[PDB]
């Protein structure tokens, strides 16, 4: 619609992104599984996990796709899927002033090829993904805990990991050191059920 409340939408960028998505799909039919452009003009390419390195290399070196900047590499944990972890690569093409997202899937066991060869920035991002979610990255130069404690056990950002964790720290005089003890909260984190019983967005309705 119109008026200040509604956000203005640019259709030109939408058309450009759709065309380029088709371009990428045609060039890489072996790996590209699905191409989507969001209504807010964000092209997303879904690729089979085996194509992490080829697709990224194409999107980085190709003359008409000069995405030479790995903006952010992250993971989304959806426990309702067999391949719960979804590895998402956010790219930036300075030459064409555009961005693209490469989304792949992985299990808790299936390794994913490291993209350090494609982007050197991928090192620490993949370390974080392994540390927080537990997605092993094959051929990684140094895959180790980057954010958790040295002796920490478990992957915190997993949806099945408790928010407060399983262990807590304190200083004990008898052992003269900081010791790890089972977590005991003086005030339990009060879970608030806020989801309304009435549907909010008809456009995103999943038919039964």
């Amino acid at each position: 619609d119109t008026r200040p409340t509604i956000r203005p939408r640019n259709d030109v960028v939408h058309k450009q992104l759709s065309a380029f998505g088709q371009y990428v799909a045609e060039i890489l039919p072996k790996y590209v599984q699905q191409v989507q452009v969001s209504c807010f003009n964000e092209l997303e390419i879904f690729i089979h996990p085996d194509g992490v390195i080829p697709v990224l290399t194409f999107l980085r070196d190709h003359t008409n796709a000069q995405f030479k900047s790995l903006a952010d590499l992250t993971a989304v944990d959806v426990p309702t899927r067999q391949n719960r972890f979804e590895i998402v690569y956010n790219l930036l093409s300075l030459r064409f002033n555009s961005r693209i997202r490469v989304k792949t899937y992985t299990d808790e066991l299936t390794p994913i090829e490291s993209s350090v060869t494609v982007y050197k920035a991928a090192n620490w991002y993949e370390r974080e993904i392994w540390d927080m979610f537990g997605v092993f990255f094959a051929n990684h130069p140094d895959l180790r805990r980057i954010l958790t404690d040295y002796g920490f056990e478990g992957h915190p950002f997993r949806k099945d990991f408790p928010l407060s964790g399983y262990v807590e720290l304190r200083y004990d005089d008898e052992v003269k050191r900081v010791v790890a003890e089972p977590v005991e909260l003086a005030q339990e984190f009060r879970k608030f059920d806020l989801n309304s019983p009435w549907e909010a967005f008809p456009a995103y309705r999943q038919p039964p």
Binding site: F161, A186, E188
Partner: protein, 118 residues
């Protein structure tokens, strides 16, 4: 059968003693909306919640007290419980039966349905 229990990091006590309940949340009787009652959910058994002496705030040692995981289908929840080695009890979804409704029956000629007041 995938055995991720060794890789989860969950303490053994909270791998065996836990009793996961797979269920579809019931509709709050106060409201009439059914949007909440559309996705399967997984919750853990409730445990002791004592009182903190200083303030009276409820204290707990259960680390999984607040863990609620939503799942698209019952099979997904069952598989996830199996992966993590948690004893899971599944409650089949209860869908209200279709009910025949007639406004005319409120003004029936020879039936009990006839309403006394509108």
């Amino acid at each position: 059968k995938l055995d991720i229990t060794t890789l989860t990091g969950v303490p053994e006590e909270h791998i065996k003693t836990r009793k996961v309940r797979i269920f579809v949340p019931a509709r709050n009787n106060m409201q009439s909306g059914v949007n909440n009652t559309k996705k399967w959910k997984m919750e853990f058994d409730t445990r002791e919640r004592w009182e903190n002496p200083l303030m009276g705030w409820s204290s707990t040692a259960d680390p999984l007290s607040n863990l609620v995981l939503t799942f698209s289908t019952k099979e997904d929840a069952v598989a996830f419980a199996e992966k993590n080695g948690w004893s899971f009890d599944v409650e089949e979804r209860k869908v209200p039966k279709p009910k025949s409704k007639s406004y005319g029956a409120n003004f029936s000629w020879n039936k009990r349905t006839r309403v006394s007041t509108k």
